[PDB]
Nucleic acid binder design. Structure first.
Length: 1133
DNA sequence: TTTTTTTTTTT
């Protein structure tokens, strides 16, 4: 049993000669400390090519962090404030996790410095005990010996519980042979369930006072059965687990530990970082849907009178719930939640109603009519009938439900960091009689005045259908995405985790196959690290040193292959000489229907051309064909034709060619890939392998062991400082199914499909018009071929294509022994896409540089297109948000938050009409214009927000500029200017890129300017202004009180609607004197006196005075006559 | 119109 004292004389300053990659990581994490501070989290994308020491670099970094923990615990043992810093290595696949853990242990055992072993054997045994691996519960159980499990059963005294013994004995007997695959499946399921039950029980006995003292052999048994217990005990602090397991958490003897809730100080290495976007998304898609009607009715019913203890452990918690209770009661009153809900009229059973919302501005309903919601009081029910109100009810219910979950999170934190979590949740839920929401709270744990983004608002999909078993009651089954994977990653960085994301394509410019790095840059700022120009040059030099193709005479040959229908026809005729025609051959022997013949001829021609060019090559021996489909038994007819062509060219060129059709993932499971390696090692001749992009994923190592007898003189080492070799010829078909679509069960709601459309709209890849059309077509059912057609129009699609190609040649370049000639055969459809690659080539692989250079040899701005789309989106969001805010203000009473939002928006626009940088907390009041300080547009501000256009696409259109609001005239007034300078309002528009959107300029900025000018002039003339109260807010601008007059005065600053207004005001406040005034205009225009009906009358009988101009537009001079005559009219009261 | 194969974990 080793101990920490083994490193007492260990030299922590002796480290191996660091590679430039290690130096780059160390330097970048050093500047992180300087710029962001010690406690700050970070994200460091590392575009390292795999096969040039990526795994060694990551694991060596992991080993260094293990040493610094030992060093700290030696030097600071007397401090007592022990902080066992957690290190994680996560990746998507189980095989890569296990392989990396094995490689770390091997690195510990066999690392040397200066020719001497790095660690003594006791030191090695100490480090290897700090490392833990956390598989799924089934495999965790099946790893354990019967001795260990019997020990933990006896020590916790479950060895007397009949069900436990029966289940364990059944599992052991099943495990006794377990050779058959279905036996393995059954054993897996049984082991998972039994492990769940056993941990549930032992957590029970450890929770109560009957604490079993773990020590020695029993302690080791538990630590083997529960590897997470070592982390809780402080005995281990390095974990190897998958992304799915990381998101779900792992058990110890107390409870389940969620790494996401305790990310402060953690260092997290994520292999294939961009792949984890899709994995995290798949985990977020799997949440359980919830009926909103039932949820809101339960919340309203239980919060009506149930209350908590009023003890010191519940301080300030009821105050967290007080707003939610008020909202629940008002909601239940407005929508009459005493009654249940049902549909009326149109056959709901014929087709259910589906509603989609992004919670901000993209709303789509499957019903062709606008469904409304009526509370019948005779038939006491709420009826959903087709004449909207149903979407309003659903949106409000969703808001209240999410509010309840967020308030529960806040109450859990107020109650307290993670051992207290379960107790807090159970105490709060049991005090309120809300135990039915326990699972929802457990899963859920992980506005114009704010930063708005899809990535932290997500989406909602609501399905309205009849309840199960009833034909007269309807439920609202809602499934949510509360955040995108980018939001989760940014949350981890903000929680304090240092994330080291390693992938050759870590910064691919796609939001479908990678995180949104525009959003991550906005949200993390400079906590999103980036290796610099000099660092990238050093890494490029290091990669060149290890892959010196040019000095060693290795030649990369790239050929783009078009379709070869004539040559394919010749081969087809030779394959079946007695058949009449080639199309007949395809239709009959190959099985290609006439509809698919044009495509199958298109792709089989290029593949066979590549194979012929490979076999005709003299000394190449290893060809990998990467297609989109597996050539297996389901395509056996096509294989035979390919096999015939291979045999023909083998006879013609006198080289035997072994073909490996259908190397599937399950094939590589049952029949290992080393069969190809063994054949290349022992048999003379060429090899052709037929795989797919999805089959040859990360971690599949395709190199083979070199046998110098068979290789000839073709191989040559390219490394400067030095036997295996790799692929020498590759065929790259154009990747096809590039929208994420998992076929299995949890994707039945198509939530992952709306996520992609909303991500593309967020990025600026789609206009809001296209995004909303695509969302509508998705809701009403959509062919994958049509969704894929929609996706193909983006530039995100092309970035994803290049990402797929860049990894294919990266995974096949894993050794330093190369042929004198490497053949790259590319589908011609990739030539246009690869020609458009324009990023910095410093970290590209040599094969990818060759592909791009060949594509460019035969030869639209994306940021501009993004600017147009984002201008439209920022306008549309402001357009819909203002209408909702105005609607809520006009629904009296107006809540405090709505008034605060209105004033905050107006104040922000007044102080900052333009901003130099992209704002954080008011980002969607503005748009980034192509011309600084001004822009043009064209669209109906009262009409459709999708039908807006913008910069030079509309050269003759309405201008948004400082001139068009006459701000310069406004400030030249002698009274307005001191008011503006004291209030901090802008006297002029800065020439900046971000200018306010057309909706803000027309509907808010101009009105705020007018109101501020009026209040500026009148305040200098003994007028006192009071706040309009919430009963009739936004009907009139200001309460006015003048010295010597006690009749209440009402102000409007810019006829039957106005009649409704003046009646509504005088109903509450009695007769009052009203002012209608425009701040700017012609002072020579006569002043009007109107009655309650806006009819001209005598000044003494008039109730409303209309001043056509308060300040002269010609020279900013105050209309003194108007003010004096208004004062005289006030004195006539 | 475009034209598929892969995966983890708890339940």
């Amino acid at each position: 049993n080793v101990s920490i004292e083994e490193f007492t004389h260990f030299d922590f300053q002796l480290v191996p000669e660091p590679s430039p990659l290690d130096l780059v990581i160390t330097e970048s994490l050093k500047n992180h400390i300087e710029v962001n501070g010690v406690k700050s989290g970070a994200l460091l994308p590392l575009p390292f090519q795999t096969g040039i020491g990526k795994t060694y670099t990551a694991l060596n970094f992991l080993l260094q962090q293990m040493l610094e923990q030992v060093r700290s615990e030696l030097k600071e043992e007397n401090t007592g404030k022990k902080s066992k810093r957690l290190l994680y290595y996560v990746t998507d696949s189980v095989d890569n996790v296990v392989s990396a853990k094995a490689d770390l242990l091997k690195l510990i055992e066999k690392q040397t410095v200066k020719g001497e072993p790095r660690f003594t054997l006791e030191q090695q045994e100490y480090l290897k005990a700090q490392i833990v691996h956390l598989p799924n519960q089934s495999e965790q159980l099946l790893q354990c010996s019967d001795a260990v499990l019997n020990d933990v059963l006896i020590g916790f005294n479950l060895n007397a519980e009949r069900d436990v013994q029966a289940e364990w004995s059944a599992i052991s007997g099943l495990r006794r042979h377990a050779s058959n695959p279905e036996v393995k499946i059954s054993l897996n399921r049984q082991a998972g369930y039994f492990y769940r039950n056993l941990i549930d029980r032992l957590q029970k006995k450890q929770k109560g006072a009957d604490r079993v003292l773990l020590s020695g052999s029993l302690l080791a048994s538990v630590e083997t059965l529960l590897p997470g217990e070592k982390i809780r005990n402080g005995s281990a602090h390095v974990a190897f687990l998958t992304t799915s397991k990381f998101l779900k958490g792992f058990h110890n003897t107390r409870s389940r530990y969620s790494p996401l809730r305790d990310l402060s100080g953690a260092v997290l290495i994520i292999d294939e970082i961009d792949k984890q976007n899709q994995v995290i998304l798949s985990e977020l898609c799997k949440q359980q849907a919830q009926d909103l009607i039932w949820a809101i009715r339960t919340l309203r019913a239980n919060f009506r009178d149930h209350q908590l203890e009023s003890s010191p452990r519940y301080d300030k918690i009821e105050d967290l719930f007080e707003p939610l209770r008020e909202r629940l009661e008002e909601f239940g009153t407005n929508w009459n939640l005493a009654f249940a809900f049902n549909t009326e009229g149109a056959n709901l059973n014929e087709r259910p109603v589906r509603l989609f919302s992004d919670r901000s501005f993209t709303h789509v309903s499957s019903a062709t009519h606008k469904l409304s919601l009526k509370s019948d009081f005779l038939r006491r029910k709420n009826l959903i009938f087709s004449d909207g109100l149903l979407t309003r009810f659903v949106n409000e219910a969703d808001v209240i439900y999410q509010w309840f979950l967020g308030t529960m999170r806040k109450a859990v934190f107020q109650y307290w960091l993670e051992g207290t979590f379960q107790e807090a949740v159970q105490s709060l839920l049991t005090h309120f009689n809300l135990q039915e929401f326990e699972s929802a709270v457990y899963e859920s744990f992980d506005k114009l005045s704010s930063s708005k983004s899809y990535h932290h608002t997500g989406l909602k999909l609501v399905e309205v259908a009849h309840n199960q078993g009833t034909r007269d009651t309807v439920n609202c089954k809602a499934s949510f995405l509360n955040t995108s994977p980018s939001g989760v990653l940014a949350d981890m960085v903000d929680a304090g985790a240092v994330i080291l994301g390693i992938s050759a394509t870590a910064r691919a410019d796609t939001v479908i196959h990678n995180f949104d790095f525009k959003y991550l840059n906005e949200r993390l700022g400079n906590k999103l690290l980036s290796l610099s120009r000099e660092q990238k040059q050093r890494v490029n030099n290091y990669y060149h040193s290890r892959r010196n193709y040019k000095d060693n005479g290795v030649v990369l040959t790239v050929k783009y292959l078009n379709s070869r229908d004539a040559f394919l026809d010749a081969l087809l005729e030779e394959y079946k000489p007695e058949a009449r025609s080639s199309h007949f051959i395809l239709n009959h022997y190959l099985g290609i229907a006439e509809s698919e013949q044009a495509f199958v001829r298109s792709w089989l021609s290029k593949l066979l051309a590549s194979i012929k060019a490979f076999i005709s090559s003299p000394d190449n021996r290893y060809m990998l064909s990467l297609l989109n489909r597996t050539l297996d038994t389901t395509r056996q007819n096509i294989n035979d034709f390919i096999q015939f062509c291979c045999d023909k060219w083998a006879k013609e060129f006198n080289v035997k060619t072994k073909t490996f059709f259908g190397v599937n993932a399950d094939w590589m499971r049952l029949v290992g890939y080393d069969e190809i390696s063994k054949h290349l090692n022992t048999e003379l001749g060429k090899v052709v392998v037929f795989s797919t992009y999805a089959s040859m994923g990360a971690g599949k190592n395709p190199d083979y062991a070199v046998n110098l007898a068979l290789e000839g003189e073709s191989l040559i080492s390219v490394a400067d400082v030095t036997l295996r070799s790799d692929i020498d010829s590759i065929y790259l078909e154009k990747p096809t199914q590039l929208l994420l679509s998992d076929d299995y069960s949890h994707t039945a709601n198509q939530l992952c499909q709306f996520h992609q459309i909303l991500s593309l709209q967020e990025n600026g890849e789609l206009s809001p018009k296209s995004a909303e059309n695509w969302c509508r077509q998705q809701l009403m059912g959509m062919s994958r071929e049509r969704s894929l057609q929609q996706y193909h129009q983006t530039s995100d699609y092309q970035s994803a294509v290049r990402k797929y190609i860049e990894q294919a040649v990266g995974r096949a370049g894993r050794t330093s022994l190369k042929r004198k000639q490497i053949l790259l055969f590319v589908d011609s459809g990739l030539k246009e896409i690869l020609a458009e690659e324009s990023r910095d080539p410093s970290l590209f692989s040599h094969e990818y540089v060759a592909l791009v250079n060949k594509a460019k040899s035969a030869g639209e701005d994306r940021a501009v297109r993004r600017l147009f789309n984002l201008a439209q989106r920022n306008n549309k969001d402001g357009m819909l948000s203002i209408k909702a805010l105005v609607h809520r203000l006009h629904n009296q009473p107006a809540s405090k938050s709505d008034i605060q939002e209105w004033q905050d928006i107006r104040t922000q626009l007044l102080r900052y009409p333009t901003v130099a940088f992209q704002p954080e907390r008011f980002n969607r009041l503005y748009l980034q214009s192509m011309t600084k300080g001004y822009y043009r547009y064209q669209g109906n501000l009262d009409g459709d927000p999708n039908s807006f256009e913008f910069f030079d696409r509309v050269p003759y259109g309405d201008m948004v500029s400082e001139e068009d609001c006459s701000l310069a005239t406004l400030v030249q007034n002698q009274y307005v200017r001191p008011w503006f300078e004291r209030k901090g309002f802008a006297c002029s528009w800065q020439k900046e890129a971000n200018v306010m959107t057309p909706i803000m300029f027309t509907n808010i900025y101009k009105g705020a300017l007018g109101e501020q000018a009026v209040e500026a002039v009148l305040t200098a003339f003994d007028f006192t202004f009071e706040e309009v109260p919430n009963s009739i807010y936004e009907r009139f601008d200001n309460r006015v009180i003048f010295a010597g007059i006690e009749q209440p005065i009402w102000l409007d600053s810019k006829s039957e609607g106005y009649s409704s207004k003046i009646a509504l005001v005088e109903e509450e406040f009695g007769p009052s004197k009203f002012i209608y005034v425009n701040a700017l205009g012609d002072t020579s225009k006569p002043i009007r006196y109107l009655n309650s009906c806006f009819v001209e009358t005598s000044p003494q009988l008039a109730k409303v005075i209309e001043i056509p101009a308060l300040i002269d537009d010609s020279n900013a001079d105050t209309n003194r006559t108007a003010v004096q005559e208004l004062i005289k009219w006030l004195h006539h009261s």
